[PDB]
Structure 1
């Protein structure tokens, strides 16, 4: 077991609790007509409290448990927890969590006697739950057990599936809520495990409040059946179409709850799952692009004080885009055309073949560069043009299966009429890329539930009381395509900035300042 111990008077320990002092500095800016930027530095001191006692087991409930990602997630936990080595044509392989930033990345803690960097595991600075301690269950409109799910997904090595057969065969998804109009029509045949059935045993959208109550109870039941104290819910089911947001329906917490009781057509299954989780005080993460978090739902989360986050896992093509586009603009290069094509042959692609479902994904993938473009008016302005042509395409091509093929072209302008053209072919084994990110989201969300803080009054010791994070956990942005935000705030999509935020947060909790890369030990005499 690796650990970190910082010698600092900013941190004090007491009864499994870590209390850390931190001075947060930032600055407010105004721009004069003359083109002058007036910068006024701001400061706010805090005391962060971290409950060091992490749960021995963490309950995980996945909506879409029997899908490619859901089944692969369960397989990865079982394989790593029980060290299930498996056979491949390249020999015996040992399970690992590669692709997971929380489990397989490192962070610089400082320098050695020679002035060179010393790194430690991301999850070694402070106590975090291990995916090996995840107790997983969930719902799926299809009743196939998880062994059948692995067979169906065609994601994992045959021998590994066989070694996991006995255990996975026993994991069966709980019945779920299936409202036909929210996902592709071609999914009809797949639905045979539903709770919303009428007297004649037929799927119905009537009684949405009852469906909501069933989900809340499902959570309570799962918790007690596993003698668990903490649970997190994550949506990893078919991408739904967007719902319309209209006054009097889902614009406020009050209207939202009433609309559910009224079986309103703007209430999707994800809307119900999110509402149920929020009401149970269980963090809810949206791994898909539909606009689940309508204003009325955000309001509900704010009122209940329950964490919510998400909107589409940022796993491959978009993850790279949030790195490349940022790099080009940061370098003073001007992207003017970004074409992104994708073809895959799994059920995700099958569902996305329907225009309404595709639309949701089109928006999340296209929006990732908006803030980057708006950050540079030297390159993007009225005189030179402030637009970047951007197209997103997703086609269902059964033969490639889960190995989604992303083909992109980044065409940029250089000085004096020149250009730079970067063409990419990226083979994305979607579930293997996504599963570790789902793991990261769960690990980081749990960590955040143990953090509280209070503003410090410079002239009054121990003033105010501890509070939890604002409900929308933007700290999870690294893993999501279209970061949900607090009203009024714009999202920041740059991958490196998103990781830096997490890095500096873990650092401040153990008494360390932000990474500055100034390296004065080397640059100054």
Structure 2
């Protein structure tokens, strides 16, 4: 086992509790009616409290348990938990979690003897839950046990599915909530595992409060049956249609909970799964694009003080594009056109970047981008995901650049480890407590929990759901920095500056 012992007094231990002091330095900027920036620094001290005792088993309830991500996840955990080696064309492979930052990436702790960089495992600084400690279950509008889910999905090697057959067969998703009007038609017959059935087994959108109670009961039951204390709920099911945000309906907490009791039309399944989890007090992550997190719902999250994070899983084509686009502005290149294309076979941003650079995107030179996306359905590819993106930037003196990003991989294989990270991090956050510190008054204040809306998880979410007034930040590399810096911080380590003065300077 690997661990780090940071020798600092900025933090101490008191009963599986790590207490760290930290001086958060920022700066406020102003502008003069003549073009000037008046930067006034800011400082604010805190004391962070990390509950060192992590759960021995972490509950995981997936909405879409039978899909590609859902089945693959369980597959992975089981495989890894049991060291279920498997056969392939390349021979017997050992199971792993490649693609997981939390589980495979490293972080620089500082320099060694010879002034050279030293890295450690992302999870070797502070105690995080091992995905091998996940106790996974969930819901799905389809009853197929997880082995049939694997067969159907076609993501994992045939030999591996067979070695997992025995156990994966015993895992059957709980009946879920189905409201037909919220998803693409082709999911009709797929639904044969619904908790919402009228007096005669017929999907009925009426009685949504009865449904809200069920999911909640479901969570409570999943917990006691597994002797678990902690559980997180992650939505990874078909994308619902966007829901309209209208005053009187879901604008406030009261109006949302009401609409649920009135069986309102703007109340969706995820809204119910979301509302439940929160009232149940368990973190809820929205791995899909729809806007289940309406203002009224958010208020509930804040009131109950329960974690939430969401809006899509940022993977492959979407990451590799965030890095490519950023990089092109960090060099002062103006990417004009951007053709993006997709197409899979299974049952499945630049505006902020174009705003950070004003010498490229102003009024005289221009500030527009012809970005046209595309995800056609080429079923004849199973889970193989081909993704082409081409940027046609502008160079000095009339020249142009033309960069292409051709991508091809088993999508749900990248998605699973990403889902794993979201859970490992959100569970870790459920143990971080912080207290603001008055410089002129000792131990003033009571420890608090992260503001409900956990934005630290954005590195994995495509549309970071931020709190009101705050504009989202999609810079992928930046997103990771906040993560490591935050962990660095928690053990008494400074934020990376990359200055290297024990080399730049005599």
Conserved? CA contact 1:236–1:287, under 8 Å? yes
Q: CA deviation at 1:425?
A: 1.5
Could you tell me how far apart the structure 1 residues matched to 2:428 and 2:404 are?
39
For residue 387 of structure 1, give the secondary structure of its aligned residue in structure 2: coil
SS of the equivalent of 2:87 reads strand
* Count of matched residue pairs: 506
Offset of residue 75 of structure 1 = 0.3
Deviations 1:355-395 (A, max 9, x none): xxxxxxxxxxxxx2221111011100111111111111111
Please identify, of 465-474 and 384-393, the stretch whose mean Cα deviation from structure 2 is larger: 384-393
Q: Would the aligned equivalents of 1:371 and 1:492 in 2 still touch at CA under 8 Å?
A: yes
| CA distance in structure 1 between the aligned counterparts of 2:234 and 2:271, rounded to whole angstroms | 13
1:167-190 C-alpha deviation (Å, 9 max, x unpaired):
000000000000001011111010
Which secondary structure state, in structure 2, belongs to the residue aligned with residue 490 of structure 1?
Answer: coil
Tell me the CA shift for residue 337 of structure 1. 1.1
Alpha-carbon distance, 1:109 to partner:
0.2
1:3 is displaced (CA, Å) by: 0.3
The gaps in structure 1 that reach 5 residues or longer are 349-367
Runs of 4+ in 1 over 2 A off after TM superposition: none
Any idea what SS the aligned residue of 2:470 has? Answer: coil
Q: How far did 1:223 drift?
A: 0.2
Give secondary structure in 2 for the equivalent of 1:174: coil
Aligned-residue offset at 1:424? 2.1
2:353 and 2:299 map into 1 onto residues whose CA distance is 29
1:77 Cα offset (Å): 0.2
| Contact kept? 1:180, 1:188, Cα under 8 Å | yes
Cα distance in 1, alignment partners of residues 320 and 356 from structure 2:
19
Distance in 2 between residues matched to 1:104 and 1:232, nearest whole Å: 22
- Cα deviation per residue 1:286-331 (whole Å; 9 max; x = unaligned)? 0000001000011110100000001100011111111110000111
Q: Distance in 1 between matches of 2:129 and 2:257?
A: 34
CA-to-partner distance for each residue in 1:13-37, whole Å, 9 max, x for gaps? 0100000000000000011121110
User: Could you state the TM-score of these two structures normalised by the residue count of structure 2?
Assistant: 1.00
Q: 1:203-242 residue pairs with structure 2 within 5 A?
A: 203-242=203-242
CA shift digits 1:459-518 (9 cap, x unpaired): 111101000000111000000100000001011001100000001000000000100000
Q: Give the stretch that moved more between structures: 118-127 or 404-413.
A: 404-413
- 3-state SS in 2 of match to 1:50: strand
Q: Tell me, what secondary structure is at the counterpart of 1:254? A: helix
**Does the CA-based 8 Å contact 1:143-1:192 persist in structure 2?**
yes
Give 1:124 shift. 0.5
Given that residues 410 and 422 in structure 1 are in contact (C-alpha distance below 8 angstroms), is that contact kept between their aligned partners in structure 2?
Answer: yes
Query: Per-residue deviation at 1:60?
Result: 0.2
**Partner-residue secondary structure (3-state), 1:87:** coil
* CA positional deviation for 1:428: 2.9
Give the deviation of 1:448 after TM superposition: 0.2
Q: SS at the partner of 1:123? A: coil
Name the CA distance, whole Å, in 1 between partners of 2:322 and 2:299.
29
Superposed CA offset, 1:56-104 (max 9, x none): 0000000000000000000000000100000001000000000000000
Say whether the 8 Å CA contact 1:302–1:470 is kept in structure 2.
yes
SS in 2 for 1:347: coil
Q: Residue 64 of structure 1 corresponds to which residue in structure 2?
A: 64
> How far, CA to CA, are the matches of 1:370 and 1:281 in structure 2?
35
For residues 202 and 93 of structure 1, what CA distance do their matches in structure 2 show? 46
Matches of 1:324 and 1:514 in 2, distance apart?
24
Deviation at 1:429, TM superposition (A): 1.2
Measure, in 1, the Cα distance between the counterparts of 2:257 and 2:397.
59
Where 1:19 maps in the other structure, the secondary structure is strand
Instruction: After TM superposition, list the pairs within 5 Å mapping 1:218-367 onto structure 2.
Output: 218-348=218-348
1:384 equivalent among 351, 357, 365: 365
Q: Any conservation in 2 of the 1:259–1:267 contact (CA below 8 Å)?
A: yes
User: What TM-score do you get using the length of structure 1 for normalisation?
Assistant: 0.96
Mapped contact 1:406–1:428 kept (Cα < 8 A): no
Given that residues 337 and 410 in structure 1 are in contact (C-alpha distance below 8 angstroms), is that contact kept between their aligned partners in structure 2? yes
Higher helix share: 1
Q: Does 1:393 align with 2:374?
A: yes
| C-alpha separation in 2, matches of 1:511 and 1:413 | 44
SS at match of 1:25: strand
On the 8 A contact 1:64/1:138 being kept in 2, the answer is yes
Match of 1:506 among 469, 472, 487: 487
